[PDB]
């Protein structure tokens with residue numbers, strides 16, 4: 001089997017991407033944030049605190065003939081921006097782009113924090129990191145991919161995120177029309193539960209390539225590119241007027257700037273992030289100070305190849321016995 005679903009930016013800045021997901025019988029379609037940095041599928045629901053829901057679409061398990069409460073199971077998770085959600089669990093039928101999994105754990109939100117409530121475009125998350133990070137207690141649950149893996153033509157999924165445009169998530173196959181050149185595969189460590197790999201270096205604009213190992217994660221659920229302070233200083237030093245601002249929370253630059261590209265290494269191959277991809281617009285409405293898309297990971301504890309980087313490539317999450325990651329230009 002295979003699945004193929006379109007993923008759409010939630011706003012003009014590609015702050016995140018949503019993908020429609022069918023849950024239950026009859027189907028209830030919710031727009032989820034596919035997150036290769038976590039391993040929980042949770043949704044806004046009929047159980048969510050009423051005051052904490054504002055325009056999201058909710059899952060109502062009582063209207064689904066295939067929903068079953070997973071007795072005694074609870075869950076609780078937090079994300080990079082300090083948001084969080086928690087609740088109980090049902091099992092139900094979940095389909096993504098024509099690919100169906102029965103008995104998927106669907107984690108039902110009783111509580112979400114304000115950032116979730118405040119974002120009406122995201123109805124929940126669908127985690128695609130390794131199942132060892134799943135938060136369900138006392139019986140940890142598997143991710144949609146892990147449940148589907150045995151059925152897939154090939155035990156892979158691919159992320160093809162657009163720049164200010166829709167993209168695609170495919171399950172079970174690699175679309176050879178979706179990329180240029182060849183795919184370069186690189187080793188993955190799963191010891192922290194992430195799609196953790198090691199980049200071979202970087203370049204800033206038309207600058208020479210610096211060979212240096214940068215360990216980090218491939219994370220569709222992080223918007224920006226978070227890299228060591230040395231690397232990020234080297235980038236912003238090429239932009240007149242750029243500066244790191246503690247009040248704003250990172251590097252900002254004159255909105256009048258033309259940004260240089262950023263290249264990252266994958267084995268002997270190179271992925272180029274166009275400068276426009278690194279522009280996240282005014283820090284506040286009407287401001288002429290713009291927020292940078294490359295930021296320091298100092299303080300986070302890990303480097304993060306977020307959407308800014310992943311959208312410059314066609315990315316293969318290979319969930320074979322020994323998982324690997326593949327990157328091609330497109």
Ligand SMILES: N=C(N)SCc1ccccc1Cl
Pocket residue numbers: 035036037038079080081219221222300302304
């Ligand atoms: N992708 C996620 N759900 S968490 C990504 C992240 C953000 C900040 C600090 C660490 C991580 Cl792993």
